[PDB]
Amino acid sequence: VVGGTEAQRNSWPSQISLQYRSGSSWAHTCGGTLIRQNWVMTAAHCVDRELTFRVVVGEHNLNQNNGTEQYVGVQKIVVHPYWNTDDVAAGYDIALLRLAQSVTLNSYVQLGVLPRAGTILANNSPCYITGWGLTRTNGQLAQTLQQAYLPTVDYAICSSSSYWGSTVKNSMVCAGGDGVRSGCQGDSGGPLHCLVNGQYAVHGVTSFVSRLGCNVTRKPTVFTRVSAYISWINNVIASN
């Protein structure tokens, strides 16, 4: 997350690390949201390479033992049927991972809350992006879960010539845009948390930044808008 602040051990407890095995060891690739005791929403894009993956729930500091981590292997990766790998801009950038075990719920390991279907955030909705991704353009991944305040820019503004143009769809949330904060590489798959009737609901799954850099003026961070995809989620969990 560029322009972030270390989050607390328990501010965002649906946040998981997707890790892939790296010869001898595991490595952070992407984030995700634990949506059932054994199901993690992430990006289709994260799980695009043929690599062995584990999920880590209870993670705050990657590099150090927190006393709270549960490591569980990914059993099944269900990508959106319509996702084309060579076109993020078509949308559909979402995958559900069934975990080999169901994980223990406790203060560090909770279910993320999903929006209702159809739900569109209003231009300016208070939202937080959370992740271990790069803290600079061409920089380095964070040791400790970070957050940045990332307020929504709606379809109309986001699809003008000045901001994104046709690259962004209404299947999509663009939060941010201010030159200072946004997502960046390694936050992908992660949750956008936005405040709705006293709850933090997950409204986006982190998709893309400009080819040019993470924190770029008039290029918000783009997230798969979860409320579009609710029935697909429910169906994949119901039949699998």
Ligand X SMILES: CC(C)C[C@H](NC(=O)C(F)(F)F)C(=O)N[C@@H](C)C(=O)Nc1ccc(C(F)(F)F)cc1
Which residues belong to the annotated binding site for Ca(2+)?
59, 61, 64, 69
Smallest distance from the beta carbon of 111 to Ca ion, in angstroms? 21
230 token code pair: 């609710």
Active site residue 93: yes
Report the residue number, 109 or 189, with the smaller CB distance to ligand X: 189
Give the footprint of ligand X on this chain (CB under 6 A): 45, 88-89, 133, 167, 183-185, 187-188, 206-211, 221
User: Which residue of the set 14, 17, 93, 207 is catalytic?
Assistant: 93
Exposed, middle or buried, 181 (CB in 10 Å: 0-12/13-18/19+)?
A: buried
**Would you say 46 and 133 are in contact if contact means Cβ atoms under 8 Å apart?**
no
Q: Give the annotated binding-site residues.
A: 59, 61, 64, 69
Report the residue number, 44 or 236, with the smaller CB distance to ligand X: 44
CA–CA gap between residue 204 and residue 224 (Å, rounded)? 5
Report the residue number, 7 or 103, with the smaller CB distance to ligand X: 7
CB atoms under 10 Å from CB of 211, counted, come to: 7
Q: Which does 93 bind (CB under 5 to 8 A by kind): Ca ion, ligand X, none?
A: none
Report the residue number, 95 or 109, with the smaller CB distance to ligand X: 95
CA 185 to chain centroid, in Å, comes to: 11
DSSP string, 92-120: ---EEEEESSPPPPBTTB-PPBPPPTT--
**Would you say 140 and 184 are in contact if contact means Cβ atoms under 8 Å apart?**
no
Segment contacting Ca ion (CB under 5 A): 60-68, 179-187, 205-213, 218-226? 60-68
User: Which residue of the set 14, 17, 159, 188 is catalytic?
Assistant: 188
Q: Which does 135 bind (CB under 5 to 8 A by kind): Ca ion, ligand X, none?
A: none
Smallest distance from the beta carbon of 56 to Ca ion, in angstroms? 8
CA–CA gap between residue 159 and residue 181 (Å, rounded)? 20
Q: Which does 184 bind (CB under 5 to 8 A by kind): Ca ion, ligand X, none?
A: ligand X
Report the residue number, 13 or 131, with the smaller CB distance to ligand X: 131
Smallest distance from the beta carbon of 95 to ligand X, in angstroms? 13
User: Which residue of the set 28, 45, 60, 80 is catalytic?
Assistant: 45
Q: Which of 81, 177, 193, 80 is nearest to 130 (CA)?
A: 193
Smallest distance from the beta carbon of 7 to Ca ion, in angstroms? 15
Smallest distance from the beta carbon of 207 to ligand X, in angstroms? 5
Which residue in the block uniquely carries the two structure tokens 């992430």?
42
DSSP string, 141-180: B-SB-EEEE-PEEPHHHHTSTTTTGGG--TTEEEE--SSS
Name the residues that contact Ca ion, by CB under 5 A: 61
State the catalytic residues: 45, 93, 188
